[PDB]
Design a protein around this ligand. Structure first.
Ligand SMILES: Nc1ncnc2c1ncn2[C@@H]1O[C@H](COP(=O)(O)OP(=O)(O)NP(=O)(O)O)[C@@H](O)[C@H]1O
Ligand SMILES: Nc1ncnc2c1ncn2[C@@H]1O[C@H](COP(=O)(O)OP(=O)(O)NP(=O)(O)O)[C@@H](O)[C@H]1O
Ligand SMILES: O=C(c1ccc(F)c(F)c1Nc1ccc(I)cc1F)N1CC(O)([C@@H]2CCCCN2)C1
Ligand SMILES: [Mg+2]
Ligand SMILES: [Mg+2]
Lengths: 274, 310
């Protein structure tokens, strides 16, 4: 039983609504991140599958993975993770426009495959890798949060959960867009996400920067008609780098590399670097 | 225009002079009007002027350069002044949130109303379509503005029987910034616009038609009713969009809707944006010629449907 008593968390400032929760900064033996789940339908089959999933996430410990400090059911369904001091990658790249050095950009990507590999090594699909879920703890280290939790990234009607696209789609592999597969979420749907993250790093932009239509993107990426414009890669990005990004972005999921090989490519690219 | 409309248009302009800088501390929350999938809205009292408005609150995470442009571009709404367009009182950024301030429409959106009403009558839909056609025109001629998303929750209505457009695309950035934030479950996006082509008011007209049919039968019409639920009188977003493009458009049911109305929507819902009718044509269609002629008690129908008096 990994639950926390009701009056243990000192819920504080409301911070923002994501693809599957609202986050409040909390207090609980130091600052925490309390995410109040949008599934407030604690089904009997759900509460045992989310209990099981918290079991796996609780024992995931890695320097590039956000600590999963447990959860709460009283008042309603909630989640307590480590509070990050410092802004998310998305805020750095796209809001503050932090002027990272070329080598540091690589190392952000290295530290991220670093963590994502641990996940896949412990047989965890992220499902929701995006730069909003990569924080830069003390600006140095990379921390990946918001992983797993499939049972609460969908809503339930009994013992069957319909998997809904929620939040932002820019990172969704095309098979995840379509939702036509069995489970379309896979180690390559994560790798594809990572590919978009690389695009952010190499270009300083989100993809499809020239399309102010959301549904257009959904249809076209799902149908294969649309993929990121890679010429937008900044002038001084390693040739070896651009190529790695295009492998992850392969439309057919089965041409995408796995993280064992991805992480290798980067460290090779890191070492050989003036 | 009309004599009674010129009363209402100047009454607003004068109520707008009592409004100055909109400070967040100048406001008292009355009641929540609901959230959407971009912002959340409050009925509020502007302490200085004493007025009552609606305050849409968009919490976005965008770089300040962009935000400052969205605010610049929302000041264009001080110039939209049609009886078919919701009134605008000002727009500003405070505390992490863009506020858009607009007149309260006490009837709500046609979506709110459609839920309160099951389905909506054709005599009514007629007078609605007249309004939307007029609002869409006023935005294209006088401003060269494409609504960019016509849907029932973007048409508002009030107890004086007014029908007005709102949430229209006067800042492209703001539309864009709100959409990566919360993808929905429905889509009024015409099939060209889903494939990258944009067609001025042609792609809005399609949205209207779709909205007409949803209001008319009481259910979002994609895919069509499964034969049996029709006689009663979940789908993946990528698939709705695949359907819109790769399947015939929706149509009204036979026999229970006028020949002039089944036609008006069907001309609205043509998948080729060029065969689809334009504003000049819809404006002089059978169904609009007649429904304009029909005298209908709109405000009474509305207040009856919401559960209020006259
Ligand atoms: N552990 C955390 N510590 C501090 N801030 C956090 C933490 N997790 C999330 N946030 C912030 O909370 C806000 C929204 O949280 P969240 O629900 O994760 O939305 P999102 O990350 O943008 N989309 P998603 O994570 O895919 O559902 C953002 O301003 C984040 O930077
Ligand atoms: N000026 C207004 N007066 C009264 N009700 C309003 C007004 N503006 C919006 N609403 C209603 O308040 C709720 C939330 O507002 P809004 O965000 O405009 O809804 P929405 O259209 O469903 N979201 P979106 O898909 O982003 O356009 C809805 O139920 C609207 O019908
Ligand atoms: O809230 C808006 C909206 C978007 C762009 C814009 F310029 C606006 F001015 C918007 N709001 C708005 C406009 C005129 C009046 I009078 C009052 C208002 F509150 N939108 C567009 C929207 O309906 C959806 C969300 C994103 C998907 C497409 N549009 C919500
Ligand atoms: Mg996050
Ligand atoms: Mg609206």
């Amino acid at each position: 039983d990994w639950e926390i008593p009701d009056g243990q968390i000192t819920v504080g400032q409301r911070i923002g609504s994501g693809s599957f929760g609202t986050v409040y900064k909390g207090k609980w033996h130091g600052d925490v991140a309390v995410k109040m789940l949008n599934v407030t339908a604690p089904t009997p089959q759900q509460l045992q599958a989310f209990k099981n999933e918290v079991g796996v996430l609780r024992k995931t410990r890695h320097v590039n993975i956000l600590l999963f400090m447990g959860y709460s059911t009283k008042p309603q369904l909630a989640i307590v993770t480590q509070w990050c001091e410092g802004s998310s990658l998305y805020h750095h790249l796209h809001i503050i426009e932090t002027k990272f050095e070329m080598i540091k950009l690589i190392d952000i990507a290295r530290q991220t495959a670093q963590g994502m590999d641990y996940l896949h090594a412990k047989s965890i699909i992220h499902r929701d890798l995006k730069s909003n879920n990569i924080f830069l703890h003390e600006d140095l280290t990379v921390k990946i949060g918001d992983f797993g939790l499939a049972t609460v990234k969908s809503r339930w009607s009994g013992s069957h959960q319909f998997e809904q696209l929620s939040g932002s789609i820019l990172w969704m592999a095309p098979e995840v867009i379509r939702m036509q597969d069995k489970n379309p979420y896979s180690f390559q749907s994560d790798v594809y996400a990572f590919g978009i993250v690389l695009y952010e790093l190499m270009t300083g932009q989100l993809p499809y920067s020239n399309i102010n239509n959301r549904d257009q993107i959904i249809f076209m990426v799902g149908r294969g008609y649309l993929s990121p414009d890679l010429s937008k890669v900044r002038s001084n990005c390693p040739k070896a780098m651009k190529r790695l990004m295009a492998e992850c972005l392969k439309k057919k999921r089965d041409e995408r590399p796995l993280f064992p090989q991805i992480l290798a490519s980067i460290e090779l690219l890191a070492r050989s670097l003036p | 225009l009309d004599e009674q409309q010129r009363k209402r248009l100047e009454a607003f302009l004068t109520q707008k002079q009592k409004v100055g800088e909109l400070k967040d501390d100048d406001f008292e929350k009355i009641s929540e009007l609901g959230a959407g999938n971009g912002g959340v809205v409050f009925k509020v009292s502007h302490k200085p002027s004493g007025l009552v408005m609606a305050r849409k609150l968009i919490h976005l995470e965008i770089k300040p350069a962009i935000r400052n442009q969205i605010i610049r571009e929302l000041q264009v709404l001080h110039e939209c002044n049609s009886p078919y367009i919701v009134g605008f009182y000002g727009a500003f950024y405070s505390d992490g949130e863009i506020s858009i301030c607009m007149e309260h429409m006490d009837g709500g959106s046609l979506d709110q109303v459609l839920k309160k009403a099951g389905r909506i009558p054709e005599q009514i839909l007629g007078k609605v379509s007249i309004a939307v056609i007029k609002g869409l025109t006023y935005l294209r001629e006088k401003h060269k503005i494409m609504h960019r998303d016509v849907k029932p929750s973007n048409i508002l209505v009030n107890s004086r029987g007014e029908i007005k457009l709102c949430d229209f695309g006067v800042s492209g950035q703001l539309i864009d910034a709100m959409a990566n934030a919360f993808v929905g479950t429905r889509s009024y996006m015409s099939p060209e616009r889903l494939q990258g082509t944009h067609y001025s008011v042609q792609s809005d007209i399609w949205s209207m038609g779709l909205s007409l049919v949803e209001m008319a039968v009481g259910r979002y019409p994609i895919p069509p009713p499964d034969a049996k639920e029709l006689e009663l009188m979940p789908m993946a977003i990528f698939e709705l969009l695949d359907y819109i493009v790769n399947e015939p458009p929706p149509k009204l049911p036979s026999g229970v809707f006028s020949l002039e109305f089944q036609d008006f929507v069907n001309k609205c819902l043509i998948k080729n944006p060029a065969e689809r009718a334009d504003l000049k044509q819809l404006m002089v269609h059978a169904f609009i010629k007649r429904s304009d002629a029909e005298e209908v008690d709109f405000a009474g129908w509305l207040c009856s449907t919401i559960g209020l008096n006259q």
